[PDB]
Amino acid sequence: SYLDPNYQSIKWQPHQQNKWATLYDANYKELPMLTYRVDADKGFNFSVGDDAFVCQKKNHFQVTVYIGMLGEPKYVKTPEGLKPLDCFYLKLHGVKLEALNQSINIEQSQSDRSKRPFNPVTVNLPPEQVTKVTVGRLHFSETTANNMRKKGKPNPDQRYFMLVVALQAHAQNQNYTLAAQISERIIVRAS
Amino acid sequence: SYLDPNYQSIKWQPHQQNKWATLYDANYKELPMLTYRVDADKGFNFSVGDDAFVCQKKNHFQVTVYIGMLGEPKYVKTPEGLKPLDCFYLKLHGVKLEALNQSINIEQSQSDRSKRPFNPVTVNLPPEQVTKVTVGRLHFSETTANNMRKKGKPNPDQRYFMLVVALQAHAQNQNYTLAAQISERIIVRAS
Amino acid sequence: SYLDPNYQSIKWQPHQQNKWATLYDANYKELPMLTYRVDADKGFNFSVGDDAFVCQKKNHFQVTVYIGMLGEPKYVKTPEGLKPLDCFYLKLHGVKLEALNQSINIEQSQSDRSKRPFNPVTVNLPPEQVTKVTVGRLHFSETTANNMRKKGKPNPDQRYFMLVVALQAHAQNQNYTLAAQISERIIVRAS
C-alpha cells in the first residue's frame, strides 16, 4: 500500500549547518543567507507497511533544487578566512543510516542505459535570482541491506540510506559547503 | 488539475536568518528564540500541470502567523547594540523570483471592493503566549509575467513571486527583523 | 470532518535553538550538528472544523525521534565551558499555548491501564548512526480548557497545548538541551 506522491513527498532537514561557509559581497560584507529548497520530485514512494519511502534501484529518481541568490557573491568566508569565489557545485550523495560516515555513490543514466558516476555539477547562480537546478535520471549505486520481509513484517534489520543534497562554493582548489539538506530514510530495492 | 488544499499547502523556509535581530529581557539577557509559524490558509492552489502554487489576483488570500513569545521582551539587540523596544510589526510583501531585490506590493480589499496598500500592522505580543495574527482579504498588486501556456506546456519564461512574512521590532524610528519566512514560488493569474 | 493521518501530520519547528549546547569530540572539536527529526505518528487527527490537531486524553499517542549522531561525542560545550558527557536523555512535555511557561506533564500507560509520569528516558546514541527512539502509550495529564463548541463554532476561548520533544546531554548533574522541536497547537478532549 503506497501513498499518493502528489501529497506525500520526502521531507528534508538542514545538514551540518554549523559547518557551512558563508558568502560575502565585493564590499566584504556577509550576504543575507541564500534561499535553499530541495524536492525529490520523482522516484520515491512512501510505503505504509514499511513506514518509509521506497525506490527501485533501476528506476531513476530526480531532485530539483531552488537556490535563491541574494546579492552578488564575490568571496567565501572559510575557516581560513575570506577567499575569492571560483564557481559553485551541486553535490548529491547517499549515506548509510547505520554508518553515516559511509557514502553511497549516485550514478546517472542515459537513454542507452549506460550509467556514469554523478560527480558535482557546476551551477551558475546569477545575483538576485532563484536558479532552479534539476538533476534527473539518478540511481543509487547500491541496494539497502536486509530488504526481505520476515513473517509479513519489515525485516528487523532493514537498512536505509539518506540522500544529501549540498551547494558548495569552490575557492583555491577547495570546496566549502554553503547549504545542505539531508532526507528522511529511504529503502532501495532491486526487484 | 489541482491538488486538495486541505492536504497541499504552501511550504515556507526561514528568510535571511543571519540578519535577524534578537530580543532581550529586562535583565539584559537574550530571550529563548520566539516560536514562529506561517500558514497561507486561503487563496493558493497547487497546479499539477504548472508544478507550482497558483492564485488569482482578484481572489483574496489569507496568511495566519503564530508567534510564541517566550519571556518578556524589553530590548532589541541590533547591529548598533541594545535598544529599547517600542512595538512589533508584521510585514508582508512579495518578491520577484527572477529579481529578488524587486518587491511586489500587497493590497488589502474591503467588502465595497476598495483596496488599500497593506502596510505593516502593529501586533501586540504579550509575554509567555502564542499570539495568532490573521491577515485576510489580501491581493498581490501585480500578475506574474508570462503566464500564458505555449503548446499546452508551461510558458518556458513563466515568472513567479515568493511571499515574505516578517516579524519586526521597532526601536528608535528603525525596524529590525526578528523572524521571517519566505514561501515557495507562486503564479499569479489575472483571469 | 477529519483529515487522513497518512497525509496530514503534526508539523514541528526548532524550539529555543539559540539556547542549545553543542557536542565536542575527543580532540576538543565541535561535531557536525546531529540530525534530528520528530514524528507524532499515532494519536493526533486534524479537525477541519477546529482548524487544529485533536487528540483524546484517554487514547494514547506516540512520538518517534530519529537522532543521527555524526562523529563520536565526548564533551558538551555548555555556557560554563566544556564538560565530559555522562549520558543522553529524551524529554517530552506539553506547554500551554496561552502560558508557555506552564508545563503539562505527560503520563505513560500500561496494558493494565496504570499510568506513570513520563520522565526523561536514557537514550544510547552510538557514533555515526541514526538511533530511532519510539515513545508510545503516552497521554497528556490534562485536557485543554474551553473545548465545548459555542453555536456550532469553535469556542472563542479554545485553549491549546504544544508538545516539546527535546534531546538533552547530561553532564555533572546538569542537563543541557542539544536539539528540541515544538509542535503546532493541539486540542486535548476528554470525551
Explain what this protein looks like in three dimensions:
- Chain A is mostly beta strands and 191 residues long.
- The first copy, chain A, has one domain.
- Chain A is 0% helix and 53% strand.
- Chain A is built from no helices and 17 strands.
- Chain A has strands at 12-14, 22-24, 35-42, 45-47, 52-56, 61-69, 75-78, 81-84, 87-96, 99-104, 106-109, 115-117, 121-123, 129-140, 161-171, 174-183, 186-189.
- In chain A, strands 1, 9, 10, 13, 15 and 16 form a six-stranded antiparallel sheet that branches.
- Chain A binds chain B through residues 6-7, 22, 30, 32-33, 35-37, 41, 66, 68-70, 128-130, and chain B through 3-4, 7-8, 11, 13, 15-19, 48, 51, 97-101, 160, 162, 182, 184-185.
